[PDB]
């Protein structure tokens, strides 16, 4: 059990600049004391100095919590008006752990004018402060793992508990994974049905796959809106600006009427418009390598008859493994250099821009081999003839002293590639994610009274790295892209993916439990830029499915064009119909509208009109007029 | 000048059922007296009985106006909170004429439980009440016409005055017409440039026309939102239900917490799903006639050599004129019968459904001849061979006693048709709209003291019909469809349209001034279903332009398919970019958010933490720890 410790600061001290390190330590202690948090100090690993900080006075902390809740309600991020006095607001809803931890973290690091102290390491006057991290709970982790590992389905209460404990981002990711796993069932069902009844490359399968993709996307959007409203986060616009921000001037904010720094959006749009040449450059760089190694593989495997073919067959795999990391790193460095000068105000926008910049690289790294195999190899077996000859010539130049074989296309290559990507890639990915990092950490670790165990545990936790949710989102997005794009060439893929997803729904949890330290609980409204990635992947799959089903079934061009047209237009019509049907039917919006309603409700001219100046006289004159007529 | 009269009721009395008519008259007088409005009675045309009604007590009317304003603010249709007491709300903003007239009309006709009396003629117990209409003002009409006829451009003040006087629907229509006229300038500019420099059937012209169409649509949507917020109408949801409504049960409204009748939306969607067979049936019915008369015209004009060709050349025009009205009437009756059982709650939804049902008929009536000429005649001159032979055979059967000529396609047919539709159709439409109805009314008209002139004027106004804004909207939509669809075949069209639009911007006003009586001032939020019509017309034109430019320039199919693909994808990309750019940049939303913001703001555990219980001691022990290290 934790010893009442709220936050821990590492504060590594190098051997050199000892006076500067001591000055930083005393300044940090002074700042934390003047903020109003109780602090201690203990030993580090070998040169650091671990310190523990916690809240001292519960009453002032409760007052600050109430003020933060009032501000959040005032800014419009929640729909429940708090009580006027602090007598039941903290009793009707207890202060959850995540909210208290987030408030403490915001107190620790913020500008001195409004917050407590700018203890952020990126200030350039606060160095040697390596990281600030909270502490894990062993009993809760064990109970959560045991409960989750022995249940066939997960109700909303588990996701609510995850939101209460670990914040909103992890809960959103787990809810998205649960929804994806639940919606992946129908894919598997009718894919297995088609594989049993029909054959390979079926048009109906592609059409129904597009329909399922659009239906799932719309339903997930609606459920995401509902969940965002339920948890009381909406447009979380209120975040503080990044320290590295450049502004031309300061004006008056039209909403709050406060002086804020203003940067025109036209300059930002003009800077953003330059992304296209970067995309083209990375596209060319990745293609010129992937195609080359793939062609080398086709040469080595297909057209060759010399001994020792098995030994030489591993050349392109190690070539890719050695080569693609450095190209990816150079391109990522260029993308970071580009994004640094974009002048993004909020940190979340900066992270979204970085994710969008990386997405193209991950997309091609995942799909270029399949695209080359399915669009260049199977339909046209003669376009690759000179490239092969090229390689053959080099073989002669390599030999300096060779038999060959007539080239014939093998239709089973795509099935083997899809089977590999569906089974072996998933198995290797799970092994790398779970087993090896724990073994590495344990091997690295192997090589006062009543508190030595706690100190050892906190040191071990400080040794570990920080957990990130971007990787899991990227993996799930790539899996969905595979399903939406290339499932028409091997219908049994989805079923296998389903099984993997189930294991992931627990495996990722284990990754949080033991192999990483608890992240800082942040608040987010949506999953982020992944919605656009999902939409683009679905749209591109809607075309690629029909292109593959026509080009891999003398291949008239007009037939392929007509198939692409029909598939795309059917996808658009289905999307419109699904959107209309869903819009015709959300408790969250109704609740917000009702709350707003309740809040609002809580607060010849004169003589003409004199002739018949009565009731009986008018009726009498009307009767006389009727009788005269 | 009006004699203080607010509203006029006709109350025609037939010769038969005199006792029933008298009973209705006395009941109506009693109801209007018990509501609280001063009423008179005068002579009619020959058997009717005109009555005048006005508000009696200004104080109670002002109180009702304030209550209505408070209710409107409470329901969320306006963003300005009224004053607590009636001392400056009626002084800061004077009660406009349109609002007072609308409130009086709502008082006159409404259910007796909440309103004054159900004087609506569609109640089946209130007959012989032909119509309730307000009175025009001659001085204001003359001044408005004189001011508008002598200004090159119109500022927002004129539209604001129109909104103040004639309500919101007419003001919205005039604002839309002004925006369309202003945005039609660039069309004319580069169309004239292309006609001077390039030749006919240019691809760049079609691409830029699509770009202009999407840009104009997005800008109009933004301006419409801004104008709707400015005038204090938003989601005008608050309208009373139609008397002819069928409900399964009554439940609690989630918003206002009041008992309202509930009809499930799934049944309505299922009923709406049957529209497709009706559309197909009307499509076939219109095509089977238009194609037949067009083919007869081609026979008579092209392949014939007998005398008296000019006399026989007018056969298909009179054939269309005689034939299409009855088909249109039958189809409209069927559509009305279908829409009556749709069970639409609000009257505006019913009108929108009727407009959407009619739109297909007007669309094909306008565009079928051009489609047949541009897609069947010019590219393939041999598909029409047997149809011609068919007609020729009948000629023999007609002769019962003939020379012919070899059939050759004339490329100038499309230019002549477009020139006709651009010049002669507009001239004839303007003449029919303006000149003939006034002459007909004057010819029909030709064949107590100090008030005879007013009685004659009111009788003449009662003679006229009711003004409707649907026709002008339909005409403008069809004009925009022509511009977006078939301008690539004759670039000089847009310029001519521009001139016509200018005249219309005054001509329609004249139509309101003299040829029609003032409509009941209603409130609307948007133009209605015309947004979907504009979007569909633009999307279809984006394809039709490229199809025409490729098929009318040995016509390989793959080239046409590729052209269609490229044009549609370019249109989609341009639409996405324009939407993003516009969203990156609206004062109305900012004002509403600021108003909402202001409204919201108006309201080993114990001993571990004891070892260093201070500030100086912590620093001293930290220094000792550092020294020991
Ligand atoms: Ca995995
Ligand atoms: Ca994962
Ligand atoms: Ca006209
Ligand atoms: Ca008009």
mmCIF file of C-alpha atoms in Angstrom, chain A residues 2-6 13 18 22 25-27 29-30 33 38-49 52-54 73-75 254-257 265-266 268-269 272 448-451 454-455 539 543 557-558 561-562 564-565 568-569 572 580-581 584-585 590 593-605 607-612 614-616 618-619 621-623 625-626 628-629, chain B residues 2-6 13 18 22 25-27 29-30 33 38-49 52-54 73-75 254-257 265-266 268-269 272 448-451 454-455 539 543 557-558 561-562 564-565 568-569 572 580-581 584-585 590 593-605 607-612 614-616 618-619 621-623 625-626 628-629:
data_model
loop_
_atom_site.group_PDB
_atom_site.id
_atom_site.type_symbol
_atom_site.label_atom_id
_atom_site.label_comp_id
_atom_site.label_asym_id
_atom_site.label_seq_id
_atom_site.Cartn_x
_atom_site.Cartn_y
_atom_site.Cartn_z
ATOM 1 C CA UNK A 2 1.120 3.551 -0.744
ATOM 2 C CA UNK A 3 2.423 5.588 2.196
ATOM 3 C CA UNK A 4 0.097 8.510 1.520
ATOM 4 C CA UNK A 5 2.432 9.721 -1.242
ATOM 5 C CA UNK A 6 0.744 11.715 -4.012
ATOM 6 C CA UNK A 13 22.017 15.236 -9.901
ATOM 7 C CA UNK A 18 27.348 20.331 -8.018
ATOM 8 C CA UNK A 22 22.336 22.238 -5.011
ATOM 9 C CA UNK A 25 17.412 21.698 -5.193
ATOM 10 C CA UNK A 26 17.050 24.483 -2.626
ATOM 11 C CA UNK A 27 15.050 26.634 -5.057
ATOM 12 C CA UNK A 29 12.235 23.009 -2.114
ATOM 13 C CA UNK A 30 11.469 26.690 -1.483
ATOM 14 C CA UNK A 33 7.031 24.856 0.308
ATOM 15 C CA UNK A 38 4.292 18.792 2.109
ATOM 16 C CA UNK A 39 7.614 17.508 0.765
ATOM 17 C CA UNK A 40 10.297 15.043 1.868
ATOM 18 C CA UNK A 41 13.605 13.801 0.441
ATOM 19 C CA UNK A 42 15.283 10.394 0.149
ATOM 20 C CA UNK A 43 18.053 8.585 -1.713
ATOM 21 C CA UNK A 44 18.079 8.007 -5.463
ATOM 22 C CA UNK A 45 19.505 5.262 -7.653
ATOM 23 C CA UNK A 46 23.176 6.292 -7.467
ATOM 24 C CA UNK A 47 23.355 10.106 -7.831
ATOM 25 C CA UNK A 48 19.716 11.297 -7.928
ATOM 26 C CA UNK A 49 17.586 12.516 -5.010
ATOM 27 C CA UNK A 52 7.857 12.876 -2.298
ATOM 28 C CA UNK A 53 5.147 15.551 -2.302
ATOM 29 C CA UNK A 54 1.556 15.458 -1.085
ATOM 30 C CA UNK A 73 -19.114 24.384 -15.274
ATOM 31 C CA UNK A 74 -18.805 28.097 -16.084
ATOM 32 C CA UNK A 75 -16.715 27.444 -19.211
ATOM 33 C CA UNK A 254 -14.630 37.650 -27.804
ATOM 34 C CA UNK A 255 -15.897 34.939 -25.424
ATOM 35 C CA UNK A 256 -14.420 35.629 -21.982
ATOM 36 C CA UNK A 257 -13.440 39.270 -22.528
ATOM 37 C CA UNK A 265 -5.174 31.687 -39.007
ATOM 38 C CA UNK A 266 -4.301 32.566 -42.616
ATOM 39 C CA UNK A 268 -1.076 28.965 -40.250
ATOM 40 C CA UNK A 269 -3.076 27.725 -43.251
ATOM 41 C CA UNK A 272 0.128 23.983 -43.507
ATOM 42 C CA UNK A 448 15.681 2.764 6.961
ATOM 43 C CA UNK A 449 13.709 -0.037 8.597
ATOM 44 C CA UNK A 450 10.069 -0.740 7.639
ATOM 45 C CA UNK A 451 10.492 1.336 4.446
ATOM 46 C CA UNK A 454 8.760 0.687 -0.445
ATOM 47 C CA UNK A 455 11.982 2.424 -1.497
ATOM 48 C CA UNK A 539 -12.889 5.220 -48.539
ATOM 49 C CA UNK A 543 -12.111 1.267 -54.268
ATOM 50 C CA UNK A 557 -9.945 -1.074 -69.004
ATOM 51 C CA UNK A 558 -13.569 0.050 -69.340
ATOM 52 C CA UNK A 561 -13.369 1.758 -64.604
ATOM 53 C CA UNK A 562 -17.062 0.824 -64.483
ATOM 54 C CA UNK A 564 -14.634 1.322 -59.617
ATOM 55 C CA UNK A 565 -17.394 3.821 -60.431
ATOM 56 C CA UNK A 568 -17.591 4.105 -55.087
ATOM 57 C CA UNK A 569 -21.089 5.388 -55.867
ATOM 58 C CA UNK A 572 -21.442 7.005 -51.108
ATOM 59 C CA UNK A 580 -29.825 9.961 -42.507
ATOM 60 C CA UNK A 581 -31.165 6.936 -40.618
ATOM 61 C CA UNK A 584 -33.453 10.460 -37.595
ATOM 62 C CA UNK A 585 -33.086 8.610 -34.272
ATOM 63 C CA UNK A 590 -31.255 15.614 -24.801
ATOM 64 C CA UNK A 593 -30.663 20.591 -23.759
ATOM 65 C CA UNK A 594 -32.799 19.820 -20.700
ATOM 66 C CA UNK A 595 -30.102 21.164 -18.368
ATOM 67 C CA UNK A 596 -29.856 24.376 -20.400
ATOM 68 C CA UNK A 597 -33.661 24.654 -20.386
ATOM 69 C CA UNK A 598 -33.792 24.273 -16.602
ATOM 70 C CA UNK A 599 -31.015 26.834 -16.132
ATOM 71 C CA UNK A 600 -32.852 29.304 -18.377
ATOM 72 C CA UNK A 601 -36.169 28.718 -16.591
ATOM 73 C CA UNK A 602 -34.558 29.133 -13.156
ATOM 74 C CA UNK A 603 -34.479 32.910 -13.689
ATOM 75 C CA UNK A 604 -63.185 59.541 -41.427
ATOM 76 C CA UNK A 605 -60.773 57.781 -39.053
ATOM 77 C CA UNK A 607 -65.822 58.279 -36.607
ATOM 78 C CA UNK A 608 -65.443 55.071 -38.639
ATOM 79 C CA UNK A 609 -64.683 53.072 -35.478
ATOM 80 C CA UNK A 610 -67.490 54.734 -33.478
ATOM 81 C CA UNK A 611 -70.555 53.814 -35.569
ATOM 82 C CA UNK A 612 -70.862 50.369 -33.919
ATOM 83 C CA UNK A 614 -70.717 47.659 -28.904
ATOM 84 C CA UNK A 615 -71.704 44.013 -29.183
ATOM 85 C CA UNK A 616 -75.498 43.945 -29.558
ATOM 86 C CA UNK A 618 -72.975 45.133 -34.255
ATOM 87 C CA UNK A 619 -75.139 42.003 -34.400
ATOM 88 C CA UNK A 621 -76.679 46.050 -37.867
ATOM 89 C CA UNK A 622 -75.263 42.849 -39.369
ATOM 90 C CA UNK A 623 -78.708 41.248 -39.320
ATOM 91 C CA UNK A 625 -77.429 44.263 -43.624
ATOM 92 C CA UNK A 626 -78.136 40.583 -44.323
ATOM 93 C CA UNK A 628 -81.334 44.129 -46.950
ATOM 94 C CA UNK A 629 -79.154 41.928 -49.179
ATOM 95 C CA UNK B 2 -55.318 52.659 -43.762
ATOM 96 C CA UNK B 3 -58.177 53.488 -41.389
ATOM 97 C CA UNK B 4 -56.526 51.801 -38.416
ATOM 98 C CA UNK B 5 -57.674 48.404 -39.715
ATOM 99 C CA UNK B 6 -55.478 45.467 -38.691
ATOM 100 C CA UNK B 13 -72.409 33.959 -47.665
ATOM 101 C CA UNK B 18 -79.050 31.273 -45.092
ATOM 102 C CA UNK B 22 -76.378 33.670 -40.100
ATOM 103 C CA UNK B 25 -71.866 34.965 -38.510
ATOM 104 C CA UNK B 26 -73.280 35.449 -35.010
ATOM 105 C CA UNK B 27 -70.991 32.757 -33.577
ATOM 106 C CA UNK B 29 -68.943 37.801 -33.882
ATOM 107 C CA UNK B 30 -69.387 36.343 -30.387
ATOM 108 C CA UNK B 33 -65.841 39.820 -29.122
ATOM 109 C CA UNK B 38 -62.813 45.361 -31.886
ATOM 110 C CA UNK B 39 -64.855 44.292 -34.915
ATOM 111 C CA UNK B 40 -67.106 45.967 -37.488
ATOM 112 C CA UNK B 41 -69.110 44.813 -40.516
ATOM 113 C CA UNK B 42 -69.672 46.169 -44.030
ATOM 114 C CA UNK B 43 -70.889 45.123 -47.471
ATOM 115 C CA UNK B 44 -69.186 42.514 -49.635
ATOM 116 C CA UNK B 45 -68.872 42.058 -53.384
ATOM 117 C CA UNK B 46 -72.402 40.771 -54.058
ATOM 118 C CA UNK B 47 -73.282 38.241 -51.312
ATOM 119 C CA UNK B 48 -70.329 38.308 -48.874
ATOM 120 C CA UNK B 49 -69.984 40.375 -45.689
ATOM 121 C CA UNK B 52 -62.702 44.514 -40.035
ATOM 122 C CA UNK B 53 -60.943 43.583 -36.787
ATOM 123 C CA UNK B 54 -58.295 45.410 -34.780
ATOM 124 C CA UNK B 73 -36.222 33.855 -25.423
ATOM 125 C CA UNK B 74 -37.002 31.004 -23.015
ATOM 126 C CA UNK B 75 -37.352 28.454 -25.835
ATOM 127 C CA UNK B 254 -37.875 15.348 -22.628
ATOM 128 C CA UNK B 255 -37.154 19.069 -23.132
ATOM 129 C CA UNK B 256 -40.067 21.029 -21.660
ATOM 130 C CA UNK B 257 -41.531 18.273 -19.475
ATOM 131 C CA UNK B 265 -40.022 7.859 -36.405
ATOM 132 C CA UNK B 266 -39.455 4.323 -37.724
ATOM 133 C CA UNK B 268 -42.455 7.522 -40.845
ATOM 134 C CA UNK B 269 -39.143 6.343 -42.325
ATOM 135 C CA UNK B 272 -40.978 7.574 -46.735
ATOM 136 C CA UNK B 448 -71.160 55.825 -47.084
ATOM 137 C CA UNK B 449 -69.483 59.176 -47.696
ATOM 138 C CA UNK B 450 -65.728 59.664 -47.131
ATOM 139 C CA UNK B 451 -65.219 55.865 -47.133
ATOM 140 C CA UNK B 454 -61.475 52.804 -49.121
ATOM 141 C CA UNK B 455 -64.248 50.241 -49.610
ATOM 142 C CA UNK B 539 -23.127 17.449 -58.164
ATOM 143 C CA UNK B 543 -20.465 15.068 -64.188
ATOM 144 C CA UNK B 557 -15.560 4.381 -73.626
ATOM 145 C CA UNK B 558 -12.503 4.297 -71.355
ATOM 146 C CA UNK B 561 -15.084 6.974 -67.957
ATOM 147 C CA UNK B 562 -11.687 8.452 -67.059
ATOM 148 C CA UNK B 564 -15.996 11.422 -65.497
ATOM 149 C CA UNK B 565 -13.808 9.970 -62.734
ATOM 150 C CA UNK B 568 -15.971 14.038 -60.004
ATOM 151 C CA UNK B 569 -12.873 13.484 -57.864
ATOM 152 C CA UNK B 572 -14.957 16.358 -54.290
ATOM 153 C CA UNK B 580 -11.955 23.303 -44.504
ATOM 154 C CA UNK B 581 -10.887 26.837 -45.446
ATOM 155 C CA UNK B 584 -10.980 27.692 -40.341
ATOM 156 C CA UNK B 585 -12.287 31.280 -40.439
ATOM 157 C CA UNK B 590 -19.526 34.233 -31.440
ATOM 158 C CA UNK B 593 -21.632 32.038 -27.323
ATOM 159 C CA UNK B 594 -20.884 35.368 -25.630
ATOM 160 C CA UNK B 595 -24.545 35.802 -24.669
ATOM 161 C CA UNK B 596 -24.637 32.298 -23.179
ATOM 162 C CA UNK B 597 -21.376 33.016 -21.335
ATOM 163 C CA UNK B 598 -22.781 36.232 -19.863
ATOM 164 C CA UNK B 599 -26.002 34.486 -18.826
ATOM 165 C CA UNK B 600 -24.008 31.717 -17.128
ATOM 166 C CA UNK B 601 -21.728 34.214 -15.364
ATOM 167 C CA UNK B 602 -24.692 36.298 -14.168
ATOM 168 C CA UNK B 603 -25.405 33.679 -11.486
ATOM 169 C CA UNK B 604 5.389 3.111 9.009
ATOM 170 C CA UNK B 605 2.673 5.437 7.681
ATOM 171 C CA UNK B 607 5.939 8.219 11.331
ATOM 172 C CA UNK B 608 7.209 8.394 7.736
ATOM 173 C CA UNK B 609 5.660 11.852 7.280
ATOM 174 C CA UNK B 610 6.885 13.100 10.684
ATOM 175 C CA UNK B 611 10.669 12.694 10.321
ATOM 176 C CA UNK B 612 11.030 16.047 8.502
ATOM 177 C CA UNK B 614 9.394 21.509 8.593
ATOM 178 C CA UNK B 615 11.215 23.623 6.032
ATOM 179 C CA UNK B 616 14.713 24.236 7.426
ATOM 180 C CA UNK B 618 14.227 19.292 5.152
ATOM 181 C CA UNK B 619 16.903 21.483 3.556
ATOM 182 C CA UNK B 621 18.794 16.779 5.807
ATOM 183 C CA UNK B 622 18.927 17.130 2.017
ATOM 184 C CA UNK B 623 22.291 18.880 2.253
ATOM 185 C CA UNK B 625 22.307 13.473 2.117
ATOM 186 C CA UNK B 626 24.069 15.214 -0.780
ATOM 187 C CA UNK B 628 27.170 11.836 2.168
ATOM 188 C CA UNK B 629 26.716 10.864 -1.495
#
